Amino acid sequence: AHGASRYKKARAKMRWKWKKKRTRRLQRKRRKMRQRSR
Amino acid sequence: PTKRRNGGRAKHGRGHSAVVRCSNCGRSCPKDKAIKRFNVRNIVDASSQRDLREASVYNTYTLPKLYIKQCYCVSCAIHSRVVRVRSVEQRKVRENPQR
Amino acid sequence: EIDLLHPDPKVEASKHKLKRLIPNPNSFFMDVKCPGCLQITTVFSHAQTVVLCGSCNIMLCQPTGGKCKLTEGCSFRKK
Amino acid sequence: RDGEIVFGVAHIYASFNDTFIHVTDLSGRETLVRVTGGMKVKADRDESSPYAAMMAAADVAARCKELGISAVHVKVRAAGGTRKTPGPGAQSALRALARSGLRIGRIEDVTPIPTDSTRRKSGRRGRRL
Amino acid sequence: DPFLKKEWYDLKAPTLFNVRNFGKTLVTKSQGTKLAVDGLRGRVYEVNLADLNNDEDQGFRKIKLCCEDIQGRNCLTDFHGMDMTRDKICSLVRKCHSLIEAFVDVTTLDGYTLRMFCIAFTKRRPEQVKSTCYAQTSQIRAIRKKMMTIMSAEASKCQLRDLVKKFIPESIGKDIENACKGIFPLQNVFIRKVKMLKKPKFDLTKLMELHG
RNA sequence: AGGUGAAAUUCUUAGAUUUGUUAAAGACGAACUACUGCGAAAGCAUUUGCCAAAGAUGUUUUCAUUAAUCAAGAACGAAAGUUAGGGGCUCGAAGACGAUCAGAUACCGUCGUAGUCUUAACCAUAAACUAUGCCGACUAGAGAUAGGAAAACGUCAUGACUUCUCCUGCACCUUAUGAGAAACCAAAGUCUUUGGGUUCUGGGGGGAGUAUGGUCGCAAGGCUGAAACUUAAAGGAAUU
């Protein structure tokens, strides 16, 4: 996890707001693909 | 680390302040953290106003002053050299320069 | 340099009610003389109600925040 | 004629990008002469400039003498509204009406101001340049 | 070439103001269907009071005049409303005072109805060391109600012709101040702005009594 | 005319932009506005009335331990978003062209649908911040400030102001043989001279707020929440 630090960005990084969104699109896709195989 | 004890917004026991748009930038900043200079000034400078005293109708006339309240963005101020920037010690002073 | 056992009369008068060494009330009672009647009435200094006379109701005092106002020229003697 | 010094309100609209010099009767319904910074100068940059607003007022000065008008009430104006700080034309245009010899009276700021209103352009983070 | 088709008309003020002259305007030459004196009717004329007085005082404020009737290169104005200049009201606004405002919609004995406004600012005393000074809302409400009642009473008792006269010496502003001291001292106390909502009928014979 | 760093798209003699007086529409309440107020937090600035509710102060009223903190469980919870009706001015994710540039799906410019506003449901998260849990005791002064209360042969006319004391607020300045890694701190003090009461959370950095299972949701997603493998440093505050 990460909790409060979540977006510390102490050193050059991707940027948390973008990172959260990128993972959401990966996750959303995982759903329809897993429901397709039912 | 905290650069200011205050945080620069000067807000206590609210949780929510009013908002104003910057006069140059456009930006929504909080009213408390805006940085405001109420510019009173007469319309025609100083040097040029003697033309109006020469030319005009009526025996004397008070040339009426222009009243506006400017509000700034921090970034608009520091670019335009209203505030620039200060040392860590001299930061803390809150008085009027040019009383 | 300090005396907690024997504090000064001047300073302990200034303090709050309860913060004094012995707590006691700064309110008091009054024998009030309204202008018409020769009668007298025992009235509390801080009165929360509009106090009437002993017969044929005039009005002694109207309630306020703290001490009640007494109605026009009428004298009062503390107990 | 008999009582000299007849008046007419002048309406110096002076935003950024252009300066408008307008002359009208006291009622204000009927106009007398209209000049726009950009009628004089043809850059687009120099529509707003000190010289264009000065040269605008000289044509207004010439036309005012012919029609009747020997004197001018005046009403300066920034764009104001949502956008309230009158442009570099307004310094030079008001000076230029003096050097003609129109008789000036009664200056007013009349730039329109809300009692909080509407929303301004350029979004939340503003016109980042 | 366009302005050969026009001719000048002369505006005339009320007798109340004290200066007959001031109104100069051009309505253009008349044409059968759309004639000049129709188009000249119902124009509106914001004019400074220190012009009408003819003395250098009351630079602030403006009086609006609309010409109800026209007769032979002359225009006869009964007034539309009152206004204050933005130089004045913005100079009076300073930091660390309590701005009070008020209004009432009021009917005169003469038919038409008005919507007056008032502005009052609390004033520091002599020998006052307090940094700011303010009115405690409750105090403000009492003052505000007092302002409207006083304003309402004055407008109602006097007809519009009479009412304009009250405005010239600014007597109404003074009256509110001396009533309200009991709550809070105040300063300035202007009437600011007035707006006619009706104009009741035309009435030619009533308007000629004004123009002496 | 517009607009810009400079221009163009766009609007214009079938009369724009500017001048003036109206009318309609729906937003938003400038200046006064503050190291001010109120509110459990989210939040709350036009006038007047109605409807309950709250704190502080005052009290030689009353009950007499009725209290503090809280696994379960429950109410409210900005903005965005959703569902069904209204309303739709301005602004304006998408989209559209016009610029800039090597390219520019961006910054800049001109239009512009959802949305923004409101009634009725949902959602339940924000740098939702004082990044400091909630009650209690004691530590240190000065001057301001908001609310209430008492005093003065006080000054001007029940109130405004002056001087002084009391509690209750938001803070601020100065200083410590008090604390801290330091920045700084009337609390982060009274803690190796270690125990006033209590709730929740953390154990090197990733993998990961991911996988699977559960449960709430109309969805978006929320709450709970691993491992294999990986790595010698990540991280904090000051100095040059």
Coordinates of C-alpha atoms (C1' of nucleotides) in Angstrom, one line a residue, chain F residues 8-119:
Chain F
rA8 C1' -5.5 34.3 -38.0
rU9 C1' -10.3 31.5 -37.4
rU10 C1' -14.8 34.5 -36.1
rC11 C1' -18.3 39.2 -36.7
rU12 C1' -19.3 43.3 -40.3
rU13 C1' -22.4 48.8 -44.7
rA14 C1' -29.0 43.3 -45.5
rG15 C1' -25.3 48.8 -40.4
rA16 C1' -21.1 45.4 -36.6
rU17 C1' -18.1 47.3 -32.3
rU18 C1' -19.2 51.9 -29.6
rU19 C1' -24.0 55.9 -27.6
rG20 C1' -28.9 55.9 -24.9
rU21 C1' -33.5 54.3 -22.8
rU22 C1' -36.2 49.9 -21.7
rA23 C1' -37.9 44.5 -21.3
rA24 C1' -36.9 39.2 -20.4
rA25 C1' -33.8 35.4 -18.6
rG26 C1' -31.1 32.8 -15.2
rA27 C1' -26.7 32.9 -12.4
rC28 C1' -23.7 35.5 -8.7
rG29 C1' -23.8 38.8 -4.0
rA30 C1' -18.2 43.1 -5.5
rA31 C1' -16.0 47.6 -2.5
rC32 C1' -17.1 47.3 3.3
rU33 C1' -13.9 41.9 4.2
rA34 C1' -9.8 41.7 8.8
rC35 C1' -3.4 36.9 10.9
rU36 C1' -12.7 38.9 12.5
rG37 C1' -17.4 35.9 13.6
rC38 C1' -20.6 31.2 13.5
rG39 C1' -20.7 25.8 12.7
rA40 C1' -19.5 18.5 15.0
rA41 C1' -16.7 18.6 10.2
rA42 C1' -18.1 19.4 5.1
rG43 C1' -19.2 24.5 5.2
rC44 C1' -21.8 29.4 5.9
rA45 C1' -21.6 36.8 3.3
rU46 C1' -28.1 41.2 -0.3
rU47 C1' -33.4 42.9 2.6
rU48 C1' -37.5 41.4 5.6
rG49 C1' -40.6 37.8 8.2
rC50 C1' -41.7 33.0 10.2
rC51 C1' -39.9 28.2 12.4
rA52 C1' -37.3 25.4 15.9
rA53 C1' -31.9 24.9 17.7
rA54 C1' -26.7 26.3 19.9
rG55 C1' -22.4 28.4 22.7
rA56 C1' -20.5 32.0 26.2
rU57 C1' -21.8 35.0 30.1
rG58 C1' -24.8 36.0 34.7
rU59 C1' -27.2 33.1 38.9
rU60 C1' -26.8 32.9 47.9
rU61 C1' -32.3 28.4 41.5
rU62 C1' -32.5 22.8 40.8
rC63 C1' -31.2 17.1 40.5
rA64 C1' -26.9 14.7 43.1
rU65 C1' -22.3 11.2 40.2
rU66 C1' -26.1 10.9 36.2
rA67 C1' -19.1 10.9 34.0
rA68 C1' -14.6 10.2 30.3
rU69 C1' -13.1 7.3 26.0
rC70 C1' -15.3 4.4 22.7
rA71 C1' -14.9 -2.9 19.2
rA72 C1' -19.7 -3.6 16.9
rG73 C1' -23.7 -0.3 15.0
rA74 C1' -25.7 4.7 13.4
rA75 C1' -26.2 10.2 11.3
rC76 C1' -23.9 14.1 8.3
rG77 C1' -19.8 14.3 4.7
rA78 C1' -16.9 20.1 -0.6
rA79 C1' -15.8 19.1 -5.8
rA80 C1' -16.4 15.6 -9.6
rG81 C1' -19.8 11.5 -11.1
rU82 C1' -24.5 8.8 -11.5
rU83 C1' -30.4 8.2 -11.8
rA84 C1' -35.4 10.9 -12.9
rG85 C1' -37.9 15.6 -13.6
rG86 C1' -37.2 21.3 -14.1
rG87 C1' -33.9 25.4 -15.7
rG88 C1' -30.0 26.5 -19.1
rC89 C1' -27.2 33.4 -18.4
rU90 C1' -22.0 32.9 -18.2
rC91 C1' -18.1 29.7 -17.9
rG92 C1' -16.8 25.2 -20.0
rA93 C1' -13.5 18.1 -19.4
rA94 C1' -15.0 16.1 -24.9
rG95 C1' -15.2 17.8 -30.0
rA96 C1' -14.1 21.6 -33.8
rC97 C1' -11.1 24.6 -36.4
rG98 C1' -7.0 29.2 -36.3
rA99 C1' -2.0 29.8 -34.5
rU100 C1' 3.0 28.5 -32.4
rC101 C1' 6.6 24.3 -33.3
rA102 C1' 11.0 20.0 -36.1
rG103 C1' 6.2 17.8 -34.7
rA104 C1' 2.0 20.2 -30.5
rU105 C1' -3.8 15.6 -30.2
rA106 C1' -0.7 21.1 -25.3
rC107 C1' 0.3 26.1 -23.4
rC108 C1' -2.3 31.0 -26.6
rG109 C1' -6.9 32.3 -29.5
rU110 C1' -12.4 31.6 -31.4
rC111 C1' -16.9 28.8 -31.2
rG112 C1' -18.8 24.8 -28.0
rU113 C1' -22.4 19.4 -26.0
rA114 C1' -22.1 17.1 -20.9
rG115 C1' -21.5 19.7 -16.6
rU116 C1' -22.2 24.4 -13.6
rC117 C1' -27.9 26.1 -10.9
rU118 C1' -32.6 23.5 -8.4
rU119 C1' -36.3 19.4 -6.4

